[PDB]
Every structure is written in C-alpha cells, then in structure tokens.
Amino acid sequence: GPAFEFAVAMMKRNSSTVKTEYGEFTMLGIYDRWAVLPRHAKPGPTILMNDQEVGVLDAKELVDKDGTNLELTLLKLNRNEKFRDIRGFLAKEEVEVNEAVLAINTSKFPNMYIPVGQVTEYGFLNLGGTPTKRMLMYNFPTRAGQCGGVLMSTGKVLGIHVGGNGHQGFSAALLKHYFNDEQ
Amino acid sequence: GPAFEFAVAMMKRNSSTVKTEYGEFTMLGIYDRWAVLPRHAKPGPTILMNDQEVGVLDAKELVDKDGTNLELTLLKLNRNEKFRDIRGFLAKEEVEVNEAVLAINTSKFPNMYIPVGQVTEYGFLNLGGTPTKRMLMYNFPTRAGQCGGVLMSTGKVLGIHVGGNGHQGFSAALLKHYFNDEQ
Ligand SMILES: [Cl-]
Ligand SMILES: [Cl-]
C-alpha cells in the first residue's frame, strides 16, 4: 500500500528494461552508473537498455567468501546519467518481511506489480544446477520474464528476482556491502 | 497507493480467472451470483472459473438505448457462493480519474497490478470492427491477456478492460444501472 507507492517511484527513478543475448531482464540502478542484473542474464561488453545500446564497462559476477554463487552481476554502464543512490534502502543483512511487492519492467511485463506476501530467508538452493546462497523466497506462481524483478517493501529494497520453481520465486538479496568498492 | 490497497482487496474478494472457448479472461463478481465479462469472451452454457467448471444460467450482451455495443456481458453463475455486493463502488456515470489501477488475474498474468495514470472519457470507438460506446481510455502499452482486467481508483471500480491498440487500453465503464434488473 505505502509499499506499492514506494515501488512505483523506485521503478520510475531507478529501473530499466534490459535485453541480453540471454534474454530480457529488469535492471535495477544502484548508484552512480553501477547497476545490478541477475547472474544468468550474462551481459557482454554491450547491452540493450530501454531499446537503446549501452556499453558495459565492467562486470562482476558476485560470490560469497567461499566462491558460492550469489546470482548477481554488478555492471558499470557507459552512460552520462547517474542513478539516484538507493543504497540507504539496502539492508546490511537478509531482511524478512510479512508483505512484499515484486516490481517487473520488461516488454513481456511492462510496469507491473505483484504482491507476493511473506518473504522468507530460504538460505541455500540449487538454481539451474548451481548452488546459490542468500536466497529470499516467496509464494510465487511464477513465469519466465520476471528475472530482475525488484522485490521491495516500504522504505526497503530487498532483492532482485532470479528464478522460481513454478510455485515459488527466489530473489537474490541486495546487500549494502556489495556496493561500496572504490569509485 | 491507497488505490492499490483497494485493488488488492477487490481482486481477492470479487475476481476470478475465467477460461472460455474464446480465451482466458478476468471476471469481476458484482453481487449475488451476477458477474461481468468483456463481450468478446462469448461465454457458453458453461465456463471454467478458477480451473473449475461452472454453469452459466443466463447471459446478457449489453447494449445502449440504440442497440450499440457496450462490450459487456452479464452472466449469472450456477454456484452457491455469493459475491460481495460491490455496486456502491460503481458510478452512475463515466468517471474520469487522474490515477488508476488496472488489476489482472489470469494464468498469463496472475494477481498483477498496473498503474495506468490518467483515465479519459474517450467516447465511441470501433473495436474489432464493432462500434462501441462508453469506453474509458488510458495510456496502455498493452498485451492480450488483460481482457477483463478491473480498472479502479480509491473507493472506485471504474470499468472492465476490453481491448487496446498496442499503445492505449480501453475499458468498458461499469455503470450502476446495468445491475439493478429484478432478482
Ligand atoms: Cl540511499
Ligand atoms: Cl456496495
């Protein structure tokens, strides 16, 4: 409710439609020109961001201290415009929530919003046969085309949607410290 | 915002997924067991409502005083359960609104919600080559699968989504007097 209001503004300011050779995804702008995609989008030296061709200057598939998959890629974009800094909205740790909003911005699902209800700390999961940490789970009658979906509550950006099993969806949690490094 | 809150509860209480031989649609329950579909869903003596087979006892394609298409079919369902009476939420006339929510409940788009912005009294329109009155229009990067989508604002059920042109969506306005007749 206020969660939706927060979600609409978030998507307007910070989200875009991205196409890779791997498919179409939602991208969440974080700060400066640093943005996040789900890992399986596998962005090359160039992406199509909002039907437009933007260079990717740098890309990091993120891993935990053991080399375990976090399912996020951090990209730096070649574009003049700077995202609003949304890092104050990111927790230092996996946040659980009774009521969330998943926000999708593709051409399959343009500016759409789903209430997913209870968001749980699921932990580990095999996703595309890859062991994956820090998954947030919610009861999600899924469909492909929601990868990159931003999962949110009021005042809170919780994570990025990176898969489902038909009946549940999973988000990679967006943690504060993924987003410090250098300048 | 409060519009979303109103929309979630509306869909929970009063909306369903309907399949006809013409496709899959959202159905809005009005009162008692009277419900509405867009006209082009063309429901037979039976529909599939929420993966389940429900008889249709009676069906009226609605027309204005001239026999012009309103693009709504009113169905009476063979089912024990009674819809909550949402007619207090229906205007006596085409309502214009600065900010609306379109709410879709299919298996293509399950429990999804779109902000459409400004809703305008468009008037007449040829829709599937059929002249159609009392269309409400909004800027809608469309897709098939949203027919029956319920268009709403706060405290207001405005109409039922019955088509688009790629760039705009159209709703048949849900007027108070469509829903009096007898018992
Ligand atoms: Cl911030
Ligand atoms: Cl009422």
Query: Which candidate in B24, B71, B94, B161 is catalytic?
Result: B71
Resolution for the entry shown, Å: 2.4
- Per the CB < 8 Å rule, is A111 touching B114? yes
Q: How far is CA B39 from the centre of its chain?
A: 10
Q: Please give, rounded to a whole number of angstroms, the shortest distance from the CA of B177 to a CA of chain A.
A: 31
Q: Please give, rounded to a whole number of angstroms, the shortest distance from the CA of A61 to a CA of chain B.
A: 31
- Per the CB < 8 Å rule, is B5 touching A8? no
Pairing of strands A150-153, B53-63: unpaired
DSSP A7-27: HHHHHHHHEEEEEETTEEEEE
Q: Beta partners for A19?
A: A24, A48
- CATH entry 3.40.50.720 includes domain A15-83: no
Domain ranges in chain B with CATH number 2.40.10.10: 1-14+84-183, 15-83
CATH topology for A1-14+84-183? Thrombin, subunit H (2.40.10)
Query: Nearest to residue A98, comparing CAs of A120, A114, A78?
Result: A120
- Per the CB < 8 Å rule, is B112 touching A112? yes
How many CA atoms lie within 13 Å of B49's alpha carbon, on the beta-carbon side?
24
Q: How far apart are CA B132 and CA B63, in angstroms?
A: 9
The experimental technique behind this entry is X-ray
φ, ψ of residue A110 in degrees (nearest 5): -80, 125
Which chain B residues have any C-beta within 8 angstroms of a chain A C-beta?
Answer: 1-2, 4-5, 8, 107-115, 141, 143
Tokens of A177: 């410290």
Q: How far apart are CA A4 and CA B47, in angstroms?
A: 33
Query: Which candidate in B24, B94, B147, B161 is catalytic?
Result: B147
Query: Which of B110, B113, B114 minimises the CB distance to A141?
Result: B110
Within 8 A of B140 by CB-CB distance, chain A residues are none
Pairing of strands A156-164, B156-164: unpaired
